[PDB]
């Protein structure tokens, strides 16, 4: 109900798909809202191609209430960051030296399972990694793995991350290593990962950029939408996690 439009509800448990990325951009500040919203606009564009409910015009800033969460559109008609949105983010940042959510937006849809939201977490000290996350909702029978791969590749091109995790909420309690990233439905790593290294993987999608393979998306399930309630989906994602660690391909969260 308030999972997408309220600011702090991103810390609460919900039923839906979650794509979490960790990156290190030494040129990105926590006050550079224009660059944050422009990167989010690229991710929104990938979602808008799949569903009309994700169109840029519908997206709004998050708020402390449903009323102020529907007042400010995130983008202009062309998809660029809107000035009213940048004006609000600059005023809320004023004085506040510490914030756990930057450029937090939602698709303005309050209907169950029809909503979506995303936010950035930029650290100015750059000792801890920067973060980006997006929440979409429970995948139905018409949820193709290629559609999720397209959204992950767009996030890789927009943030050049060190890791992207894609899994339904609640998979973290089911992953083999709690100190290392989970495979879930998909896992992106900025390394060339082959069939010989991970023979359990149902798909290994190469991600290319600047004239070479930048990384690989590891897919556990390709026949149906990944379900945390399906013990077969969890067991194969768990086997892939064990395989990746056995060959020192899976880093610890603290080491990222």
From TrEMBL:
<feature type="domain" description="Immunity protein 52">
    <location>
        <begin position="38"/>
        <end position="250"/>
    </location>
</feature>
<dbReference type="Pfam" id="PF15579">
    <property type="entry name" value="Imm52"/>
</dbReference>
<dbReference type="InterPro" id="IPR028969">
    <property type="entry name" value="Imm52"/>
</dbReference>
<dbReference type="InterPro" id="IPR016929">
    <property type="entry name" value="TsiT-like"/>
</dbReference>
<protein>
    <recommendedName>
        <fullName>Immunity protein 52 domain-containing protein</fullName>
    </recommendedName>
</protein>
């Amino acid at each position: 109900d308030k999972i997408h439009h309220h600011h702090h509800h991103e810390n609460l448990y919900f039923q839906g798909m979650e794509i979490k990325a960790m990156f290190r951009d030494v040129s990105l500040s926590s006050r550079n809202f224009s660059e944050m919203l422009s990167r989010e606009s690229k991710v929104v564009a990938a979602l808008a191609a799949k569903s009309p409910l994700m169109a840029h015009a519908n997206w709004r800033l998050k708020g402390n209430s449903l009323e102020e969460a529907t007042l400010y559109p995130a983008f202009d008609a062309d998809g660029s960051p809107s000035t009213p949105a940048l004006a609000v983010l600059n005023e809320e940042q004023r004085g506040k030296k510490h914030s756990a959510s930057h450029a937090a937006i939602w698709n303005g849809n309050t209907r169950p399972n029809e909503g979506a939201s995303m936010s950035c977490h930029v650290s100015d000290e750059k000792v801890l990694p920067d973060r980006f996350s997006t929440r979409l909702g429970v995948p139905d029978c018409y949820a193709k793995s290629q559609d999720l791969a397209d959204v992950v590749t767009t996030i890789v091109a927009a943030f050049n991350p060190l890791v992207v995790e894609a899994s339904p909420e609640g998979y973290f309690d089911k992953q083999v290593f709690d100190d290392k990233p989970g495979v879930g439905w998909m896992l992106y790593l900025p390394k060339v990962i082959t069939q010989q290294q991970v023979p359990e993987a149902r798909a290994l999608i190469p991600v290319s950029a600047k004239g070479k393979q930048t990384g690989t998306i590891i897919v556990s399930v390709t026949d149906a939408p990944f379900s945390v309630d399906n013990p077969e989906h969890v067991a194969i994602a768990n086997r892939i996690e064990i395989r990746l660690v056995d060959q020192d391909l899976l880093p610890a969260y603290v080491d990222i």
